[PDB]
Amino acid sequence: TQAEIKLCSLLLQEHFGEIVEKIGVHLIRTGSQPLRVIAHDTGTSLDQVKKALCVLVQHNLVSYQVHKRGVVEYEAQCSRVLRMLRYPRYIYTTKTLYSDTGELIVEELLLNGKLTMSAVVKKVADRLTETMEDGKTMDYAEVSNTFVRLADTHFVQRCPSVPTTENSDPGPPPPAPTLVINEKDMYLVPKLSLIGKGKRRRSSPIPDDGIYWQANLDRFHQHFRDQAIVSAVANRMDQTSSEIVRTMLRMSEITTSSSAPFTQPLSSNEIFRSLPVGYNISKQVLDQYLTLLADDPLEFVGKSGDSGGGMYVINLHKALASLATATLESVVQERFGSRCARIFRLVLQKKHIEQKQVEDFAMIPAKEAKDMLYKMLSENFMSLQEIPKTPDHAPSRTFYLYTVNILSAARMLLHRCYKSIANLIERRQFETKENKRLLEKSQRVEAIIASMQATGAEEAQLQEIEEMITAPERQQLETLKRNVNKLDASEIQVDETIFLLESYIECTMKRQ
Amino acid sequence: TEGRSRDGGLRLGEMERDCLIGYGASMLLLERLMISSDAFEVDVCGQCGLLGYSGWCHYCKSSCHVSSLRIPYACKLLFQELQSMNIIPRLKLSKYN
Amino acid sequence: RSVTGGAWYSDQDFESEFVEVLNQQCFKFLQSKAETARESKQNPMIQRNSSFASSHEVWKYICELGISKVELSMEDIETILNTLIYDGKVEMTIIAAKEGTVGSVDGHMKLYRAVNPIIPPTGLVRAPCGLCPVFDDCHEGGEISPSNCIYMTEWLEF
Amino acid sequence: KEQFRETDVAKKISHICFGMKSPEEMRQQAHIQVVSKNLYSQDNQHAPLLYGVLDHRMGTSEKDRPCETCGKNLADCLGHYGYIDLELPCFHVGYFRAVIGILQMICKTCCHIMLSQEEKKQFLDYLKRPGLTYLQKRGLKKKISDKCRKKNICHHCGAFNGTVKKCGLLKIIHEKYKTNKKVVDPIVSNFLQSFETAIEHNKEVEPLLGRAQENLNPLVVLNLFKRIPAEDVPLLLMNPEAGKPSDLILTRLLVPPLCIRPSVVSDLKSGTNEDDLTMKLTEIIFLNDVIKKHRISGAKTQMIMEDWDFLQLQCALYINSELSGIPLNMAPKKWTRGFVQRLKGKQGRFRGNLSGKRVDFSGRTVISPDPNLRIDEVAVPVHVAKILTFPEKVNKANINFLRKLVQNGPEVHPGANFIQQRHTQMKRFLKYGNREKMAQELKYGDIVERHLIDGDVVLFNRQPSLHKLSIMAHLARVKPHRTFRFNECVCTPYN
Amino acid sequence: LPDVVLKPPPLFPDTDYKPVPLKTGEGEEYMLALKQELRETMKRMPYFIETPEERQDIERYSKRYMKVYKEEWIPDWRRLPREMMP
Amino acid sequence: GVSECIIMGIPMNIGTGLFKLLHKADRDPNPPKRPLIFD
RNA sequence: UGCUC
DNA sequence: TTTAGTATATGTGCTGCCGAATTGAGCACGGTGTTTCGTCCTTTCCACAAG
DNA sequence: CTTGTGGAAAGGACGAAACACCGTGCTCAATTCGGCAGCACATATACTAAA
Numbered sequence A: 001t002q003a004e005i006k007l008c009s010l011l012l013q014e015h016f017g018e019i020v021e022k023i024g025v026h027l028i029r030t031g032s033q034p035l036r037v038i039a040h041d042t043g044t045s046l047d048q049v050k051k052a053l054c055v056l057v058q059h060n061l062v063s064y065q066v067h068k069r070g071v072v073e074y075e076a077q078c079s080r081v082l083r084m085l086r087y088p089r090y091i092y093t094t095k096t097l098y099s100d101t102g103e104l105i106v107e108e109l110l111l112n113g114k115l116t117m118s119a120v121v122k123k124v125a126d127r128l129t130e131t132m133e134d135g136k137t138m139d140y141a142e143v144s145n146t147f148v149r150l151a152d153t154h155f156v157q158r159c160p161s162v163p164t165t166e167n168s169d170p171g172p173p174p175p176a177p178t179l180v181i182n183e184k185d186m187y188l189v190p191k192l193s194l195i196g197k198g199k200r201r202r203s204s205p206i207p208d209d210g211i212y213w214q215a216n217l218d219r220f221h222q223h224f225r226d227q228a229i230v231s232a233v234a235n236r237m238d239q240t241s242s243e244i245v246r247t248m249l250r251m252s253e254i255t256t257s258s259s260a261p262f263t264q265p266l267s268s269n270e271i272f273r274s275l276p277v278g279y280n281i282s283k284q285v286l287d288q289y290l291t292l293l294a295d296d297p298l299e300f301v302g303k304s305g306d307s308g309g310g311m312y313v314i315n316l317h318k319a320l321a322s323l324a325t326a327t328l329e330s331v332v333q334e335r336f337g338s339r340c341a342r343i344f345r346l347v348l349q350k351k352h353i354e355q356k357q358v359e360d361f362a363m364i365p366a367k368e369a370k371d372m373l374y375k376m377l378s379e380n381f382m383s384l385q386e387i388p389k390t391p392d393h394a395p396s397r398t399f400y401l402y403t404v405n406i407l408s409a410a411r412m413l414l415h416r417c418y419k420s421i422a423n424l425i426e427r428r429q430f431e432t433k434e435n436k437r438l439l440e441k442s443q444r445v446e447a448i449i450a451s452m453q454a455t456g457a458e459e460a461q462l463q464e465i466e467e468m469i470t471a472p473e474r475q476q477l478e479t480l481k482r483n484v485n486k487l488d489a490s491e492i493q494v495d496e497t498i499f500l501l502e503s504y505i506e507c508t509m510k511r512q
Numbered sequence B: 001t002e003g004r005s006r007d008g009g010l011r012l013g014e015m016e017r018d019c020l021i022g023y024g025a026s027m028l029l030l031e032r033l034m035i036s037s038d039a040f041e042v043d044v045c046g047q048c049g050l051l052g053y054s055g056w057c058h059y060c061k062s063s064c065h066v067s068s069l070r071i072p073y074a075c076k077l078l079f080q081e082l083q084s085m086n087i088i089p090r091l092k093l094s095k096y097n
Numbered sequence C: 001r002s003v004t005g006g007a008w009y010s011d012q013d014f015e016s017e018f019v020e021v022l023n024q025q026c027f028k029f030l031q032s033k034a035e036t037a038r039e040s041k042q043n044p045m046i047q048r049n050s051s052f053a054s055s056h057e058v059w060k061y062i063c064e065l066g067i068s069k070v071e072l073s074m075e076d077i078e079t080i081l082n083t084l085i086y087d088g089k090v091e092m093t094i095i096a097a098k099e100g101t102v103g104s105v106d107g108h109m110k111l112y113r114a115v116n117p118i119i120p121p122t123g124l125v126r127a128p129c130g131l132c133p134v135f136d137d138c139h140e141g142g143e144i145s146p147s148n149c150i151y152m153t154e155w156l157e158f
Numbered sequence D: 001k002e003q004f005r006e007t008d009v010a011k012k013i014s015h016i017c018f019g020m021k022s023p024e025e026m027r028q029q030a031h032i033q034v035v036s037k038n039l040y041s042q043d044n045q046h047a048p049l050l051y052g053v054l055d056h057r058m059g060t061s062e063k064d065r066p067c068e069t070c071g072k073n074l075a076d077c078l079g080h081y082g083y084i085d086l087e088l089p090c091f092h093v094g095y096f097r098a099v100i101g102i103l104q105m106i107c108k109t110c111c112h113i114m115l116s117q118e119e120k121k122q123f124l125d126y127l128k129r130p131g132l133t134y135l136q137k138r139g140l141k142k143k144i145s146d147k148c149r150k151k152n153i154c155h156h157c158g159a160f161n162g163t164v165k166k167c168g169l170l171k172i173i174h175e176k177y178k179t180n181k182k183v184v185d186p187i188v189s190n191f192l193q194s195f196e197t198a199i200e201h202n203k204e205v206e207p208l209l210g211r212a213q214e215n216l217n218p219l220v221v222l223n224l225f226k227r228i229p230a231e232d233v234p235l236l237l238m239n240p241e242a243g244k245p246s247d248l249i250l251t252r253l254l255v256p257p258l259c260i261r262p263s264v265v266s267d268l269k270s271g272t273n274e275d276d277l278t279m280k281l282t283e284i285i286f287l288n289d290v291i292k293k294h295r296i297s298g299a300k301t302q303m304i305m306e307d308w309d310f311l312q313l314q315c316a317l318y319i320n321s322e323l324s325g326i327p328l329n330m331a332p333k334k335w336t337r338g339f340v341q342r343l344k345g346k347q348g349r350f351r352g353n354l355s356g357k358r359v360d361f362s363g364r365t366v367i368s369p370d371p372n373l374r375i376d377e378v379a380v381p382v383h384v385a386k387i388l389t390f391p392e393k394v395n396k397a398n399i400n401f402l403r404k405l406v407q408n409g410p411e412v413h414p415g416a417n418f419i420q421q422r423h424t425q426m427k428r429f430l431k432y433g434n435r436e437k438m439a440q441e442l443k444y445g446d447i448v449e450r451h452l453i454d455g456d457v458v459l460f461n462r463q464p465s466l467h468k469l470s471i472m473a474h475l476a477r478v479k480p481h482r483t484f485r486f487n488e489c490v491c492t493p494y495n
Numbered sequence E: 001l002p003d004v005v006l007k008p009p010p011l012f013p014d015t016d017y018k019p020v021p022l023k024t025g026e027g028e029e030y031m032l033a034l035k036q037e038l039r040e041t042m043k044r045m046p047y048f049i050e051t052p053e054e055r056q057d058i059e060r061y062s063k064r065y066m067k068v069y070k071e072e073w074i075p076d077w078r079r080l081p082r083e084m085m086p
Numbered sequence F: 001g002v003s004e005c006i007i008m009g010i011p012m013n014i015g016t017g018l019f020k021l022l023h024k025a026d027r028d029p030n031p032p033k034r035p036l037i038f039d
Numbered sequence G: 001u002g003c004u005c
Numbered sequence H: 001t002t003t004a005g006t007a008t009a010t011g012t013g014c015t016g017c018c019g020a021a022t023t024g025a026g027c028a029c030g031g032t033g034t035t036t037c038g039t040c041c042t043t044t045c046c047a048c049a050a051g
Numbered sequence I: 001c002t003t004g005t006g007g008a009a010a011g012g013a014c015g016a017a018a019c020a021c022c023g024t025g026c027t028c029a030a031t032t033c034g035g036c037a038g039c040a041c042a043t044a045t046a047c048t049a050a051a
């Protein structure tokens, strides 16, 4: 996981700093270790190690566990450091599904990690008071309403609460409070009657103390999976099937967990009455849609029962496998052309096949299909079976069958995406560093204006800003800006493929 | 070289080294097997621990941590051969004090 | 036909242009049929049945086109449609039909329909790192470094 | 004006940290890329080709042609390495056993180590103790390997992990789809039935459907090692700073300098004497070129894998030229000297060039009895005494004696042969020039290579040594005869 | 037989396939702008601990004028173990 | 060890190299320091 | 290989 | 519900196919070096017809 | 007895291929000796079944 460690290091250096990213990388590479050994191996002061551990555990990146002799060991969560990159997508999806209030709520939750409901609503009000003007003030009523609406939808979840010290072993305080998680009050918001108005940054006891909240990344992952499946089925059959499957997934979200081979089956009557009235669709049309989706060779849904009229169930693992196959074939097509993608789909549909059979079923002349096969072999897109006639395994007396392993190929593609994002971040940082002189020059020549904007602001300071030699460098500045924008866009868009591959690799394991 | 016809010198075999060790003559053994036989001065980089040339480390593209070191030529040949075998000996130098 | 001759081989030379034209024409026909089926919007089942195209139908269509002089059998068009399926552009389904205008397979008929891809191009391919042929030799400090990369340079300049 | 930089420091090596280099580090260390399989040019000068083998940018091996990287002669050239890129990765014969061990240690699906959280913590606590020795490291490796081989299912991803063993030569087989006598699992059934098209097009696949386990070629092994979490690397008893799991599979070959590959230009014929390593590297480059040609021309998979296995075998021979699992049809015709053969053996580097090596300022002569000399004295002939010289430093005590010795010259027995000045290290031969002017200009600190005179301590030894008394330091006395004489009472020690 | 090559292959071999252009739309641009805003605002956040500067040359009267002032968040010591108190 | 000392060309720890020698030079440890007037 | 010891 | 039988399950315990070692050197010499199997280019010499 | 324009052959580079014409093909092990990996295989422990 060297690429993963590099990506985590880059993210922690770009987001938190240097003295903390070293501790994070050390925790990720060595795993759980006490504090003293971490400080000894890192080579820095103890106070810096304490600050790094505290600022990391604040964002739920690392956890602390008790062991024999009451020693505390800190273990980092590389998965969380990788999900950290998905913050822009989280903000975008919570702004699309909800109003800007929930957008700011999730933004504050992600930038602070753990906070109380009162603090987050106060910050949201203070930030939204700047959006509007004309003396209009922001009240906490609507903010708390939006917060509870996000809560009941499992988007925000209460952090693990420390058990009561008086009731649980009253006496000597342990080295660690041993925070535990309770599913009863996991999504129960506290009753806070106090209200207030946000301040406009003029620059001129807590009821919910101890109850910290955070962003439930599992709910965001489930929502992204649902959106991906909906987009896929929309591109395949029609938007009507997309709406049907969206309604089915919305109904199944509550009655199912985040990891299950099959969801709870639904009947035709409930799906019909729960579908929006905006579609002039009858019962027989819904039955036809369901029975034609069940016959789809991709197996997005399944009958799995006949009681209660039309009983159907959604296949999540099969849908994720189909999406992973789509991603793999698309990247193969974009990397080696349409003919190599044809050969890939041929060797994928046929579990085992040889060179002559591939040439016969693909109609690709010789000297070209074998070249693409060997190119894909050199890139770990497929593995050879090599069924031997004799235990000697001599090449001259054995058959070689081509076979694509979806799991290993998906893992390799995920590693490639991680290293690609790492290289993109490295290139962005290099472009920012090499041009930091022009950046500081622009910052200074623009702060000349930013200063004394209104007080003592004479007009004689507007015709001398562009008089400097920065005018011909504005072209290089714009080039750097557009390059950084495109690099960030590519990094964000590769995150979708990373999420698809991670979900496929996660939903195929048992963790037994 | 080996032979007299080839103008070769005598060989202090393993048994001669054993006798010199038994006597405890460390400086005599060093002068025989290091100074008078295959003495050489190499350049080692204190950062990566690899062998440099003319006070320059091509690996790190720097010359501030490169330092001279006395060594038997056979030992340098062994280090080079091991580096060829992917067995990289990284030398961490330090002051003689 | 296997040891010599063939509808694709012409004088011991594979006709790549011929198979390409066949694939393009078949895909255009299937896409037009699917578009007509979608625009009819009479009923989902009827829409899917109309978007479907039997091997005999597309074979007679190709024969009516008359692109090449060599006679193309039904199994030839079937192999062309199978190659198209391998391209990820069409979908085939085997339905049960005793006898009809095709009468090729006993009690089975293959119907082909143009289908859109599952998902658009992924995000990995949109970055030069995902389509790099020397991606294995990438390293922070060395001759091939992301800072002095030519692929990303040309990609940002474009 | 002038910057302060230290000229020389008395650096002493503390310890040698062994490790491995990744392909990127191999590229960084190397100076040029060797891609030409030929050695010399077509012209009659037979100069070495550029960017090819025997290029002078990777050192020099001739006294006339200097190095191209550093402008120095052969005596001062240390040599430079080169890197050769391979089309397909190959298993490192040295680390092949380590590769098998790691593959048995980690999972073949998620690349995680086959250990529970409790066992992971236990091993981390047992390894974090200071003063960990090599024996303890190997014992911990053995214990962890045993406990990992005890398990059969992965606790992280849930994928099945069968036995991983060695088949043939430089080939690894993972028995993922093993035969289950009890109720078979869905995975093995799916794998067996996925051969429908293969059986339809090739019936011979159905009888041989069994024994069709996973074959871990270098590509898959490297892809798996590149995705191993760094947290589990310490559990493999491999130092993270020394190397990485991906370094065991070699993709670049480090061609050594020419100092290790001496070339003799035999002008008496139309050929040159080269070592075996040069021929092995030439064959490896030729095989890489042939593999690239077959890939471009679209060859069959059988011959492609044959060429890949041949390249693996040639690389293994280049590393270790003495293997046992070499097929008979693939067996080498002649015998070549690999690095292992050059290291081990009686004439190896450790026993032949490090433990016991030849020295100068020494002689070998027959012995004869002479009881007229003391037991601590040995007779040296005048002929040998004039050849073995001793460097005496000119001081305030023996200034006149060295003056007289220089005045005598290399002809008269009491004298010297060379003078090394204190300021300049340019030696001066006493046979030429006015020796009197040199004697009159002997400054303090100069070195004079004086002849072996009476009173000089001299080691006297018999080559077959049983005890330490077989070699003794005596006082040399010059005599006109041609044999080494000593008191016969000292014959019993020398035997 | 394969031909001999005089010069080594190019360090960056050319490819006839180019990367697919990035997706366009208001969503992607908004996500880009939000990521840039996060980059700009998370460095000034107290959680972003900077390298403590050291080795001050001299003390001056302008120190109080150039003294960097920034509010520091107070970690909840109830949840955090005792080993991290200053 | 001794073998590594012989290979690396350094005096072995055994024998005469177990101890170190010091020079009996006329000196004065911790010489008087010049006082600082400005500080 | 032959030897010398 | 409980004692007896069947199966598995790993451990452990006895072989058999591997890989590694076998004194120190000194001195002479004779051999041979990678090549060689077939194809093509060049140069030379000589079967007759001409003085 | 000298000569020549055209022809054949012989020798020396030279490139495709892999040092054996064809595809075969043997023998001996040089003597321990400390690993081992297979198999096997045994015994007991645990769980299911009959009373």
Ligand SMILES: Nc1nc2c(ncn2[C@@H]2O[C@H](COP(=O)(O)OP(=O)(O)OP(=O)(O)O)[C@@H](O)[C@H]2O)c(=O)[nH]1
Pocket: G001, H029, H030
């Ligand atoms: N005349 C002679 N014969 C030798 C020499 N070395 C070996 N032989 C003969 O060759 C056989 C042994 O060969 P080796 O000594 O192993 O040859 P080698 O050492 O592999 O050859 P190189 O590696 O080239 O030194 C013996 O039967 C000897 O008769 C030598 O130096 N001179």
Ligand code: SF4
Pocket: A423, C128, C129, C132, C134, C135, C138, C144, C145, C146, C147, C149, C150, C151, C152
């Ligand atoms: S050369 Fe640059 S663009 Fe290409 S893979 Fe390497 S870092 Fe990415």
Ligand SMILES: [Zn+2]
Pocket: B045, B046, B047, B048, B049, B050, B057, B059, B060, B061
């Ligand atoms: Zn260096």
Ligand SMILES: [Zn+2]
Pocket: D057, D058, D059, D060, D067, D068, D069, D070, D077, D078, D079, D080
């Ligand atoms: Zn050099």
Ligand SMILES: [Zn+2]
Pocket: D107, D108, D109, D110, D111, D112, D154, D155, D156, D157, D158, D159
């Ligand atoms: Zn696993």
